[PDB]
Design a protein around this ligand. Structure first.
Ligand code: CLA
Ligand code: CLA
Ligand code: CLA
Ligand code: CLA
Ligand code: CLA
Ligand code: CLA
Ligand code: CLA
Ligand code: LHG
Ligand code: BCR
Ligand code: BCR
Ligand code: 1L3
Ligand code: SF4
Ligand code: SF4
Lengths: 80, 103, 148, 61, 773, 39
């Protein structure tokens, strides 16, 4: 499976959950921003690695990083 | 038979395509999207072609969860339907909810 | 007479291809009508070729064996027209264009002005590019900018 | 560091490391790690120019 | 009907000339990066991302069409000005066989006057010139051009017509412009393009042929000079001048109104193939041709129903009723929806039309070498190679564009609400079956043509010539194609299928070698224009290569069309668009998954296809058709000689060079590509040295593409980061930020330079070979 | 700024064509040199 990490630079813009084609991410309550929420990935077994979350993240360098790891049926995106 | 719907959900009218389920849906896993529509209307399949769904509860078996979540964003962006719930069906018949996991 | 190099005044093969070109031009004028614009062009080409072969004769172009002119670029003042005069001419015109473009970026700092060239800030930049060392060398001795 | 001040980014992984930016708004809460919003004249590869940095990552020029 | 037109939508102003990128939102904000610059060019004709109003979209399309017809009239005027001013056409009209046609000379500056060719030097043009390969001079001689002042008049008229199409574009955009339901009356546009555009066009050309072009060609073939009569052989007052040339029936047009059509059979004939005097089609057959297809096109424009103020008029068909009558049990609901698709989607219409005009340019390329249309053109071999090659390349380009806009329709204009159970929807329900069976037949064609070539390379290398797939070894004869040779040659005589044809369809089917007088310095008759073209084992093999390349280009473009919207990989591909680079490195990698990338890959595969087509053409025509009649006893000698193939026993057998050397790739390398490239590399210091310069520069552009093709932009961007550091160290700061090209643009730049370099390489090779011998 | 000629391809292309014509007439006026003559 692929490894998704969220750092402390997040602003809670809600653009990585919407642009994710798999619902890997969800917003949990946080205190480190003004939005009161931080992204999290407890669903990394379902991630394909498509990096649409990293495309739509508006910071300088990205608060979300997905690392390409071990490949499964689900993460190679196979319908067979 | 091997792709039986849950009770309460009716099948949409689709004429069958070649882009649908493969042997993985028999042996490893398949997926099921279940939504509620207020009328009968025409939606593009995520595996090619077009289908007509009826008023009430409609369920569709797909090979892949991104096929289901692409169908779900099509229903939101076209038909304003947001009560799609996505199940992972194992080959023994077990069904677990994987969207909305929050509720 | 350098290594695999003799000048034009005692090169046999230069004389051979010079005679070959002037003879080919001689029977190319000699077989045509002198009033059809072909013959006037070929006598203009003959006069041009006589002047260019005499120019290769007089200012010490250098050939050996193949008879064609080999250039010496090590910095001799006898062969100074090989490299040194076009070096200074290149540095003048390239520093003109580079300094004009740099001064244009320094005076505009704008995104419309790069895709729409304002000539009232472009042609004085070109005129001061034509005098670029006098305004470039004190900014070499001063220093530009601190970035890492 | 207040609104209108010119700052230099000290963050090593930034696009705008060693570049002057404009402070547009400073968050008055204390629970935010990076409160200071800085706009730039130059855009990044994502074609955006505004980001929230902290106080210690910025040097007043 | 009724032409509902609105008045003045757009004022005429210079307030958008100073604002480039006005036309969509992200470009309207201004330059920030250099990507904007390339995004200025790639979206400028995409009118659907400019405005969402389909009305205004159709208006921009219409004004674009008028401006295109303007630029084609400008180009027509430019070659008519060059024909009129700086040509040898005043002396080419007297010698079409010994004078090379030229319309352009290099001026004596920088040394380029060696490019002027001595064999174009004549009276009026004493400079030498660039030899043309376009066949413009042979066209002009066939249509009756005897003088350069009428070439001046046509040049002025084409410039006036370019101005008229520009004023039509400005009128039908800015001033008085039609609404969308005018464009959707497809019934009337079919009826007025068949009966009025094609029909009256070829009827007015039949009128030209009869009045001007048949008598001027009869004067030029009976043996007079350039002093002719343009005006006093015309019209009513010299009606008997029509009787002096080829007997104008009894008297006037009174045979036309009383219905005795048999007396008109001396300039409306149905004779047959090619004239042996001039090497081309008989002009009277060409006139009766254009008249019969003129009649049958005005008949074709009487098909579709149009209702209006005319009382009894309004009987016919609607296309929609025909499409909704063709249903079938295998194909569900058939063609219902295709009327709505083809009346609301421009890209589907452009896909159909690009497929048809590309296929038709390919048909034109075949039918113009085989049956020569213009006098003395088939002996001028660089014209023959260049017209076949040119129309084949333009055909392959428009077929790749057909696949492109079919995919673009599938991304943008596809509506599921129109396509319930029609042919278009059911093709999406078995797209895996189509693409996989196409994958299998491409694999089959590639093995069973190119592995035959590999097998021949291997057997000829191992010292086994009798083991070869060749005419001397294991024969693969084109027995259906040879039987169609025998049928289309044998169907001319009495008691045949067509009993009143004199000289058959074409001499390529199997009947007679035709030849023409020509000088060539101080020689004899020589110069075959056309010959029977025999099909052997090498023709089997090259045509199965051709089937392979057509089928793989089909596979790439049709997989782009059918998987434009969704796949098993990316189900939401239609939201990503026609033109996106990937959907990331995940799910294995989605590199080149967009339908644009399939157009990008099918461009190289079209290159492959058309390159092997014109290579087959060059050396088939050189090895079996083109050549010389010897002065001793009428012996046929081709441009490349016959090859004595050494057999396995020790003896030889004479084959032609096509039959002997394209069973394998070594003979394609040696006898076609090494041997015939001798005139493009030895052309320096002479009239073909530009073709050598273009050969080398095109090798350069082809190799320069491979940087863009094999690399990707993240390398280039961190390289430009180092270069931008060097720029900011010396106070040299672009406000427009220097970027690498986008991924899609790196593919586009690479395919553009690959296509340009390879085609201009083959162009330089083809012209420099065929000007020599 | 002036209409249509202030634009960067137009100003750029007229700069390249003007430099090629000035260089060309420099090659005509100097009778096409290879080197700079010293005597
Ligand atoms: C104002 C114009 C300008 C100036 C002063 C420079 C200066 C420099 N460049 Mg650069 N460059 C430019 C434009 C310019 N460049 C443009 C337009 C491009 C894109 C084609 C580049 C691409 C480029 C690369 C890849 C590199 C440099 C490098 C360098 C540095 C080393 C010298 C050199 O290699 O020349 C090279 C110059 C070129 C390759 C570009 C050709 C010259 C351009 C066309 C001039 C621009 C004309 C401009 C429009 C004039 C405006 C006039 C105004 C009055 C309107 C040097 C400081 C090198 C470096 O980093 O050295 C350490 C390096 O490798 N440049
Ligand atoms: C009489 C000269 C003339 C003038 C002053 C204009 C001026 C204009 N035209 Mg236009 N047009 C003209 C002739 C003219 N046109 C002709 C002859 C045609 C047929 C080819 C067109 C077809 C046309 C279309 C389809 C469009 C325009 C558009 C425009 C506007 C945008 C210009 C632009 O950015 O591109 C710069 C061009 C040059 C610098 C050259 C502009 C005000 C746009 C518009 O009207 O907005 C909706 C639009 O899309 N024109
Ligand atoms: C018999 C009448 C007639 C004639 C001669 C034409 C001729 C033409 N039409 Mg037109 N058209 C007609 C009736 C006619 N049309 C009617 C009745 C409708 C509406 C139902 C249309 C709607 C229409 C559209 C939408 C377009 C044309 C276009 C064209 C041009 C195609 C370019 C070409 O063929 O190459 C040869 C050129 C010449 C012979 C000159 C051509 C000049 C296309 C075009 O290019 O626009 C200018 C195109 O956009 N027509
Ligand atoms: C658009 C095509 C076109 C045009 C503009 C003309 C025009 C003309 N024709 Mg012609 N013609 C045409 C096609 C055309 N024709 C075709 C297709 C045929 C063969 C069926 C003829 C056969 C024909 C004959 C036999 C004669 C004319 C004649 C004429 C001239 C007098 C009109 C008339 O006969 O009454 C006139 C200028 C008369 C003439 O003056 O001879 C040139 C006349 O004798 N035509
Ligand atoms: C009737 C013909 C026709 C028409 C009207 C269109 C129209 C369109 N095409 Mg299309 N296409 C066609 C034929 C046609 N095409 C053919 C024959 C091919 C195969 C090559 C394609 C392949 C194609 C692709 C892959 C795409 C389009 C796209 C588009 C759309 C926008 C294009 C644009 O913005 O302009 C911009 C034009 C340029 C930036 C020019 C590019 C550089 C050219 C190719 C180099 C020219 C080299 C020159 C010929 C020779 C060298 C000279 C040089 C040395 C000076 C537009 C709707 C684009 C789109 O997004 O669709 C919605 C899209 O991506 N087309
Ligand atoms: C010369 C280089 C080359 C070769 C050999 C191929 C070969 C192939 N391409 Mg490719 N392609 C190329 C360049 C090449 N391509 C380039 C440059 C591009 C970039 C634009 C592409 C892009 C491309 C695309 C997009 C597609 C292909 C497809 C194909 C397959 C076509 C089907 C076929 O021909 O049947 C048969 C195979 C051959 C003719 C290859 C040679 C077979 C030899 C003769 C047999 C060897 C005998 C034996 C096995 C050897 C055993 C030895 C042992 C020690 C192993 C084929 C395998 C298409 C495909 O997959 O369709 C099925 C496909 O869609 N190509
Ligand atoms: C990725 C692609 C890319 C693209 C599209 C561009 C595009 C551009 N760059 Mg660039 N650049 C790039 C990458 C790129 N760059 C990279 C990688 C670098 C290295 C870091 C640079 C660094 C760079 C610099 C430093 C500069 C540019 C500039 C420019 C602009 C040039 C404007 C122009 O050519 O007209 C040229 C206009 C003229 C030459 C004006 C003269 C015309 C006269 C006034 C007309 C009268 C003359 C008359 C006709 C007589 C003729 C005779 C003659 C001899 C005088 C242009 C928009 C330049 C700019 O900003 O615009 C000025 C600039 O200075 N770039
Ligand atoms: C092929 C002969 C043929 O057309 O058969 C007939 C059949 C369709 O015929 P229909 O009677 O359904 O056609 C009615 C309309 O669709 C056409 O007017 O075509 C097919 O089977 C689908 C093509 C599959 C191609 C297989 C490869
Ligand atoms: C080359 C060219 C050109 C020229 C053109 C021209 C020269 C034109 C034309 C034209 C023409 C000159 C046309 C015409 C026509 C016609 C028509 C369209 C006709 C008709 C008809 C009719 C309709 C008839 C009818 C009838 C019948 C059938 C029956 C009996 C009676 C009658 C006789 C009535 C230019 C330079 C511009 C440009 C480029 C291209
Ligand atoms: C330094 C410099 C320079 C130089 C450069 C170089 C070194 C180069 C090169 C280059 C090369 C090395 C090459 C090339 C090439 C190209 C080509 C090759 C092209 C083209 C084009 C075109 C235009 C095309 C056309 C055509 C078509 C359209 C198709 C068909 C055929 C033909 C041909 C017709 C210059 C002078 C700028 C100036 C100064 C600076
Ligand atoms: C009047 C006139 C003509 C003016 C010219 C206008 C002026 C002044 C400059 C314009 C700069 C020019 C001419 C080119 C820049 C293009 C560029 C940054 C290429 C680097 C690059 C290479 C080499 C690849 O292989 C590649 C592969 C895959 C993806 C991306 C790339 C990529 O990005
Ligand atoms: S890589 Fe793709 S699937 Fe994974 S979290 Fe990011 S957007 Fe979602
Ligand atoms: S990780 Fe990026 S996209 Fe997601 S909430 Fe934070 S800033 Fe927004």
């Amino acid at each position: 499976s692929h490894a998704v990490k969220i750092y402390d630079t997040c602003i809670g813009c809600t653009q990585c959950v919407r642009a994710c084609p798999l619902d890997v991410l969800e917003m949990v309550p946080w205190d480190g921003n003004r939005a009161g929420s931080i992204a999290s990935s407890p669903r990394t077994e379902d991630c394909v690695g498509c990096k649409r979350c990293e495309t739509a993240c508006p910071t300088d360098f990205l608060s979300i990083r997905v690392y390409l790891g071990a490949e499964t049926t689900r993460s190679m995106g196979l319908a067979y | 038979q091997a792709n039986s719907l849950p009770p309460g959900a009716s099948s949409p009218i689709f004429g069958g395509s070649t882009g649908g389920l493969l042997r993985k849906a028999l042996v490893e896993e398949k997926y099921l999207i279940t939504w509620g529509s207020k009328e009968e209307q025409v939606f593009e399949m995520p595996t090619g072609g077009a289908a007509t769904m009826v008023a009430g509860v409609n369920g569709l078996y797909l090979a892949r969860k991104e096929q289901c979540h692409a169908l779900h964003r099509q229903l939101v962006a076209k038909f304003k339907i947001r009560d799609s719930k996505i199940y992972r069906v194992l080959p023994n018949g077990e069904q677990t909810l994987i969207y909305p996991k929050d509720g | 007479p350098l290594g695999n190099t003799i000048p034009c005044s005692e090169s046999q093969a230069f004389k051979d291809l010079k005679d070959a070109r002037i003879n080919g031009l001689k029977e190319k004028i000699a077989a045509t009508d002198p009033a059809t614009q072909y013959a006037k062009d070929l006598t203009a080409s003959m006069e041009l070729w006589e002047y260019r072969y005499a120019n290769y004769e007089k200012n010490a172009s250098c050939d050996k064996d193949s008879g064609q002119p080999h250039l010496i670029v090590d910095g001799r003042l006898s062969h100074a027209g090989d490299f040194i005069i076009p070096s200074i001419l290149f540095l003048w015109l390239a520093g003109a264009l580079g300094w004009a473009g740099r001064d244009y970026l320094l005076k505009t700092q704008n995104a419309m002005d790069e895709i729409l060239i304002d000539f009232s800030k472009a042609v004085p930049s070109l005129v001061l590019g034509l005098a670029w060392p006098l305004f470039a060398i004190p900014q070499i001795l001063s220093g530009a900018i601190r970035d890492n | 560091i207040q609104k209108g001040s010119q700052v230099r980014v000290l963050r090593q992984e930034s696009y705008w490391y060693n570049d002057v930016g404009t402070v547009a708004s400073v968050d008055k809460g204390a629970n935010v790690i990076y409160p200071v919003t800085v706009r730039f004249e130059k855009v990044n590869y994502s074609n955006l120019n505004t980001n929230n940095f902290g106080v210690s990552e910025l040097e007043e020029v | 009907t009724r032409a509902t037109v609105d008045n003045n939508p757009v004022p005429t102003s210079i307030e958008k000339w100073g604002k480039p990128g006005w036309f969509e939102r992200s470009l309207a904000r201004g330059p920030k990066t250099t990507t904007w610059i390339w995004d200025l060019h790639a979206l400028a004709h995409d009118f659907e991302v400019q405005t969402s109003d389909r009305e205004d979209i159709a208006r921009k399309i219409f004004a674009a069409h008028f401006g295109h017809l303007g630029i084609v009239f400008i180009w027509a005027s430019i070659f008519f000005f060059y024909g009129a001013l700086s040509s040898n056409y005043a002396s080419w009209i007297d010698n079409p066989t010994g004078l090379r046609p030229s319309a352009q000379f290099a001026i004596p500056v920088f040394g380029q006057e060696v490019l002027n060719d001595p064999a174009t030097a004549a009276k009026g043009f004493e400079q030498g010139g660039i030899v043309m390969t376009s066949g413009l001079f042979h066209l002009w001689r066939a249509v009756g051009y005897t003088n350069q002042t009428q070439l001046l008049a046509t040049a002025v008229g084409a410039l006036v017509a370019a101005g008229l199409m520009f004023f039509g574009g400005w009128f039908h955009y800015h001033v008085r412009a039609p609404k969308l339901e005018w464009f959707q009356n497809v019934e009337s546009m079919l009826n007025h393009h068949l009966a009025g555009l094609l029909g009256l066009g070829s009827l007015a050309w039949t009128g030209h042929l009869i009045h001007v072009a048949l008598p001027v060609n009869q004067m030029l073939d009976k043996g007079m000079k350039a002093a002719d009569i343009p005006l006093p052989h015309e019209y009513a007052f010299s009606t008997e001048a029509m009787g002096n040339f080829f007997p104008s029936f009894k008297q006037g047009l009174l045979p036309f109104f009383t219905g005795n059509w048999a007396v008109y059979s001396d300039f409306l004939t149905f004779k047959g193939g090619l004239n042996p005097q001039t090497g081309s089609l008989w002009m009277t057959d060409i006139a009766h041709h254009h008249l019969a297809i003129a009649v049958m096109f005005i008949i074709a424009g009487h098909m579709y129903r149009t209702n209006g103020p005319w009382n009894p008029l309004g009987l016919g068909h609607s296309i929609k009723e025909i499409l909704e009558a063709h249903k079938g049990p295998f194909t569900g609901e058939g063609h219902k929806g295709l009327y709505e698709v083809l009346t609301t989607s421009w890209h589907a219409q452009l896909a159909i039309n690009l497929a048809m005009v590309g296929s038709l340019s390919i048909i034109v390329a075949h039918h113009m070498y085989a049956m020569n249309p213009y006098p003395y053109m088939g002996i001028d071999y660089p014209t023959q190679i260049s017209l076949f090659t040119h129309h084949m390349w333009i055909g392959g380009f428009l077929i790749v564009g057909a696949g492109a806009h079919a995919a673009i329709f599938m991304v943008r204009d596809y509506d599921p609400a129109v396509n319930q159970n029609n042919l278009l929807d059911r093709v999406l329900r078995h797209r895996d079956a189509i693409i996989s069976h196409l994958n299998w037949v491409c694999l089959f064609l590639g093995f069973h043509s190119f592995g035959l070539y590999v097998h021949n390379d291997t057997m000829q290398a191992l010292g086994r010539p009798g083991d070869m797939f060749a005419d001397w070894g294991i024969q693969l004869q084109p027995v259906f194609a040879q039987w169609i040779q025998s049928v289309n040659a044998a169907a001319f005589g009495p008691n045949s299928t067509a009993p009143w044809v004199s000289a058959a369809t074409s001499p390529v089917w199997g009947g007679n070698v035709l030849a023409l007088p020509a000088t060539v310095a101080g020689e004899v008759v020589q110069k075959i224009s056309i010959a029977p073209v025999p099909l052997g084992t090498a023709d089997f093999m090259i045509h199965h290569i051709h089937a392979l390349t057509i089928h793989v280009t089909i596979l790439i473009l049709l997989k782009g069309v059918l998987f434009a919207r969704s796949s098993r990989l990316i189900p939401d591909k239609a939201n990503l668009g026609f033109r996106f680079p990937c959907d990331g490195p995940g799910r294995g990698g989605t590199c080149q998954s967009s339908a644009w990338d399939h157009v990008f890959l099918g461009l190289f595969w079209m290159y492959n296809c058309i390159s092997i087509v014109i290579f087959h053409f060059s050396w088939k025509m050189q090895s079996d058709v083109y050549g010389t009649l010897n002065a001793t006893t009428k012996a046929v000698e081709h441009i490349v000689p016959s090859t004595d193939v050494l057999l396995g026993n020790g003896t030889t057998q004479a084959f032609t060079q096509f039959a002997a050397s394209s069973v394998n790739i070594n003979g394609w390398l040696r006898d076609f590509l090494w041997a015939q490239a001798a005139p493009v590399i030895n052309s320096y210091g002479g009239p073909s040295a530009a073709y050598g310069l273009f050969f080398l520069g095109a090798h350069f552009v082809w190799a320069f593409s491979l940087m863009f093709l094999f690399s990707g932009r993240g390398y280039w961007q961190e390289l430009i980061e180092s270069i931008v550091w060097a720029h900011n160290k010396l106070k040299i700061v672009p406000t427009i930020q220097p970027r690498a090209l986008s991924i899609t643009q790196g593919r586009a730049v690479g395919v553009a330079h690959y296509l340009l370099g390879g085609i201009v390489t083959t162009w330089a090779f083809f012209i420099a070979r065929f000007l020599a011998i | 700024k002036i209409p249509f000629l202030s634009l960067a391809p137009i100003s750029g292309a007229l700069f390249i064509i003007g430099s090629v014509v000035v260089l060309a007439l420099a090659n005509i006026y100097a009778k096409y040199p290879l080197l700079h003559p010293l005597v």
